[PDB]
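@here heads up, posting the sequence + SMILES for the N-methylpyrimidine-2-carboximidamide run so it's all in one place. Ping me if the SMILES looks off, I pulled it from an old spreadsheet.
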Amino acid sequence: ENLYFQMKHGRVFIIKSYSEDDIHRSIKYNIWCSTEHGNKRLDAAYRSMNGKGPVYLLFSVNGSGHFCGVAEMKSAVDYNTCAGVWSQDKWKGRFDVRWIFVKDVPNSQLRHIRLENNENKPVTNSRDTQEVPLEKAKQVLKIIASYK
Ligand SMILES: CNC(=N)c1ncccn1
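bot reply: prediction finished. Complex C-alpha cells:
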C-alpha cells in the first residue's frame, strides 16, 4: 500500500501552456508566469497559505494529451520584471517554482477524476489556473507519482 497523499494543508492548480519552450525554460530556471488574473489567483493562494503547506502546479501543454509534470510555487508574484522572456512578450511578472517531478502522464490515466468546482468536468479538461479540490488533487498526485 501507498497511503502518502491520503495531509490536509495544500492547494493545487492546473497550469496550461501553449508553448513547449516556456515549459523547458521553466524547468531550467525554476520560474513561471501566468496571465494577469492567473498570477493574481496563484499569488492569493500562496500568500494565504503562509508556509503551512504547498501550492502545487500541475503542468500540461495545450493539445498535448498529457500532463508533463509537477512544480511547487516558491515565491509570491513579482509583477514588475523583465518583459519578453516567455513565448508571448506580454506576460507581466514572474514567480519562483521548484519542479518536483518531470514526466509525461497521458490524459487517459486522469480523465475519470472530475472537478466538482468546474461542473464535474474531467480534470484533463481544465483551463489555466483552474484550482483542484484537495480530495481530487490527492488522487491526481498519486496517479502521477506512480505512472511508469
Ligand atoms: C509563461 N506563461 C504561459 N506560457 C501561459 N500560457 C497560458 C496561460 C498562462 N500562461
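MO: Residues 1-148 form one domain.
MO: One more: The beta strands are 11-17, 31-32, 55-61, 66-73, 95-101, 105-106, 114-115, 121-122, 131-132.
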